[PDB]
Amino acid sequence: PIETVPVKLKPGMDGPKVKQWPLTEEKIKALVEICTEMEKEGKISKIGPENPYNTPVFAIKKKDSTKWRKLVDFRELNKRTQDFWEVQLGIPHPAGLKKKKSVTVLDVGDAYFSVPLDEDFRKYTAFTIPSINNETPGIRYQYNVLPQGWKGSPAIFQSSMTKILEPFKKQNPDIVIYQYMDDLYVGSDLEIGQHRTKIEELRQHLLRWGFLWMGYELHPDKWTVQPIVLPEKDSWTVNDIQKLVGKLNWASQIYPGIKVRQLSKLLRGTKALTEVIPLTEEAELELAENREILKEPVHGVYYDPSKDLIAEIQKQGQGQWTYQIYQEPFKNLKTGKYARMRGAHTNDVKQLTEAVQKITTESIVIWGKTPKFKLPIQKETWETWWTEYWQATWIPEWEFVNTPPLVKLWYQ
Amino acid sequence: MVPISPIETVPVKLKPGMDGPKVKQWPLTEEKIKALVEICTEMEKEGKISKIGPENPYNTPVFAIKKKDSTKWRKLVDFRELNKRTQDFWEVQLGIPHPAGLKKKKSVTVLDVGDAYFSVPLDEDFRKYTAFTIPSINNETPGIRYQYNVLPQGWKGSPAIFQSSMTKILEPFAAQNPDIVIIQYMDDLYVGSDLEIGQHRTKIEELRQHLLRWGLTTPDKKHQKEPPFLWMGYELHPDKWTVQPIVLPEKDSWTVNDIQKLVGKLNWASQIYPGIKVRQLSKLLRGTKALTEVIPLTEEAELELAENREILKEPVHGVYYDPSKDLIAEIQKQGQGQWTYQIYQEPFKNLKTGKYARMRGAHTNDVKQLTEAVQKITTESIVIWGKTPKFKLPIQKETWETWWTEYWQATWIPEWEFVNTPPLVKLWYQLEKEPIVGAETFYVDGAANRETKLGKAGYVTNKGRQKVVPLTNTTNQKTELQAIYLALQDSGLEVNIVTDSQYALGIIQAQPDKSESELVNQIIEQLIKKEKVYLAWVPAHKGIGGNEQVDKLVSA
Ligand SMILES: Cc1cc(/C=C/C#N)cc(C)c1Oc1nc(NC2CCN(Cc3ccc(S(N)(=O)=O)cc3)CC2)nc2ccsc12
Ligand SMILES: [Mg+2]
């Protein structure tokens, strides 16, 4: 693969100039060893002061692994790299991947290091290994080959990947294989038993063509918009009715025909919050009609691939997190709820970081792109700690929610 | 002749589209021209510059400057125009080491590398852009035109290219001598180690032997500074470090920049002098840009400055870093959004100190500020030492547990332990999760007319208690808060309150303990007095009783 594909930046855009954030000693030492051997293998080269660009780098440990992995935060370079109409004007996103019973995710990013990078573009991949206390100048490198995490790497490599797969693909024409950045999503409609073998024979298939032993498996038969449910009770207090009317008023922004007139009139007077109110049968009927309305899907909800996906997350307590994915307000394309985030019963931020990664993974499977997150956390807390729990090879965008949303109660 | 390796040249370019400078040489006096001709002649025989023909169309003006007693002339080429057109570089001299991260060094040698600077060649293809012209005597001959072969002083790329070339030169020597440290500071090179003076001196001689490979001669800096080194505003002593003397000036009339260098001295001193406070002195600046405006010190700024004099009365020193011992950070609340901290390994010997000031906002609480201080110290500690310190915080473990388990945001503080040093950070109120049985229920509402600013606020309760208060010069949002305040004022120790104010919920659900709104502060003071408060929200104008009745009362 000696011929490099020519790559350019977007018109009137310079290369990234992103500051390297501080790293602990053990992450620096890990990056020094990794990059020393990458330099020996020709994947990267030292650079001089005539290169003013920079992209941040840190170190992670992938799921169920103890070997340090180098992760470059190419987010700025990705939005500055030319739009890629690869060999086509696009691959239509495989709408059947989200329907398979089992999907295994395979880290294939190491294949990128076989293709050299356009020599005129290498300077824009510059990154710095910082030193502790600025006691030595940072170690400056640039990439000679397609780097993991860069937008152009799957596009430039895909023609090489299309042929590596298609012997496997015509053996199993009902296996859906999808590529997003460094990862391959291989979904089969067969029960786990021989799925692992089918992933393993892909895994050895690839190594015969020039790996990482690793794969995380998902089951997207689940992924819908969770229904709005209303309580079913034999005795309602004034407070219960008030919370119900508030929830229904919120749901009325999403669903047509929600009514709270009969339920509100039960609260005629100035009653103690704990007093039991018997429901009239007009109120029961109205409540029953609202229950029926909430059983149907929301009217006119469609995915527009030109707009951003928005993911909101609420902390619900006791390790529970709710989330909604949408592009337009009250037009949820997907909602969900999480519990029992592994390895962090006493760390809110670790739980949030794992929720972000799982929502992003779901969004990749369903739409082939990552959402923009609205995170219920102060910026300084998130920014200090999220890299400590990050285990994915991509990174989405995020913004911060500083005012407590009233609607946390409605997804409760 | 001993063959020497060439210093690898850095390729340099102009900014895209731009061309080299074309600035006219100013007229000079005959005496200055004679001076510049001699200076450049010796520079030329040393290889620094070279005569060029008339084809070069670029030019940069040259000047001749003197000094007071130095009875000679100085050359100065003003590369301001060329610097505007030169590419950006990796400025590898951005951040400096903090002394508190440094480790003890038994011996330190200083080497002068000022003349090694001129062994760094300038990129051949860029030299043409450095052209300058000595005007001739009486303008009767063509001016002598030169260009640089070496890094011009005053040119944009010279500091970055010089340090990068030296670092590349020194790289194998440092890597194969792990028991020494080397750093470059302007024309000075400092080599420290823990070797006995014999082996140390040997390593220095080996370093000179190494630098000779590139033809670099490095005598030790003339007029040896005996400790401490005066470096980057610090005093580096062999076993202690501190800032250079902090002298608060005596004044009976301060203007806004006398306070702004006061703030800078105190900000500089706050990294080793514990308890420095600057808020009441910094607040005296906000809205002015005329620096000679005399502003009276408030009684609170004289008090603050006085307290700073008492901390500055005696020099204090920080210790250097011992990697074998723990790293500990301790924080204290100072009041008015201010926090101080000390980082140490052994008790009473600080590596460094510091302070944190609350962010600007309408409402806040101590736990959020303490959390922000922790994140700042965490990030600074990773910079300086490469690790998070163990924290000692003035907040009970039970208080923190209650806070983060109930707070609507995700939050986290790393490994920490309680230190019982008042004032302790606490939660000042906690709202109920469920309505209170037997507690009176207040349905509150407020309203204001947008054009006349006339409003009402009040409540009605399940016991028939009622109140409406007329208000002037008010808004919807203020009357909604007023209504809640009145319910708290007029209720017993336990109370259920029902509002339709999303604005009031959003404030109270943020759990502030202080506000820039006096009404919110009054509500906070009432909440502190209660035993149980349940706050419930309902949507407005949906026929909900209690709420509909009071809405009528207050909406004119
Ligand atoms: C080596 C060095 C010197 C200086 C001074 C500049 C000036 N002007 C600055 C830095 C940043 C240096 O760089 C590192 N300095 C250290 N530690 C220091 C070394 C100096 N001592 C003070 C001292 C020691 C011995 C004598 S003595 N007895 O020889 O007269 C006199 C004074 C405090 C700790 N550690 C590192 C690690 C990587 S770089 C680096
Ligand atoms: Mg009203």
Numbering used by the authors:
A (entry chain B): 4 to 213, 227 to 428
B (entry chain A): -1 to 554
What does the primary publication say about this deposited structure?
HIV-1 reverse transcriptase (RT) (hereinafter referred to as RT) plays an essential role in the viral life cycle by reverse transcribing the single-stranded RNA genome to a double-stranded DNA copy. There are two main types of RT inhibitors: nucleoside RT inhibitors (NRTIs), which act as chain terminators and compete with incoming nucleotides in the polymerase active site, and non-nucleoside RT inhibitors (NNRTIs), which inhibit the activity of RT noncompetitively. NNRTIs are a group of structurally diverse compounds that bind to the non-nucleoside inhibitor-binding pocket (NNIBP) located ~10 Å from the polymerase active site. NNIBP is a hydrophobic pocket that emerges only when NNRTIs bind and induce conformational rearrangements of the residues defining the pocket.
Compound 25a shares the same central ring and right wing structures with K-5a2, but grafts the 4-cyanovinyl-2,6-dimethylphenyl structure of RPV onto its left wing. As to the Y181I RT/25a complex structure, the mutation not only removes the π-π stacking interactions in the left wing of 25a, but also introduces steric hinderance with the linker oxygen and thiophene sulfur group in 25a, which pushes the inhibitor slightly away from the tunnel. This unfavorable change in the NNIBP is mitigated by the enlarged contact areas between 25a and the more closely placed side-chains of Lys101 and Tyr183. The recruitment of Tyr183 by the cyanovinyl group of 25a is reminiscent of that observed in the structure of K103N/Y181C RT in complex with RPV, whose left wing has the same 4-cyanovinyl-2,6-dimethylphenyl structure. The ability of K-5a2 and 25a to recruit Tyr183 is particularly significant for their function of inhibiting the polymerase activity, because Tyr183 is completely conserved among all HIV-1 sequences and makes direct contacts with the nucleic acid substrate. The repositioning of Tyr183 towards the NNIBP removes this important interaction and destabilizes the binding of nucleic acid. Moreover, the higher degree of strategic flexibility of 25a (because of more rotatable bonds) can make it more effective to preserve or even enhance its interactions with other NNIBP residues when Y181I and Y188L mutations displace the left wing structure of 25a.
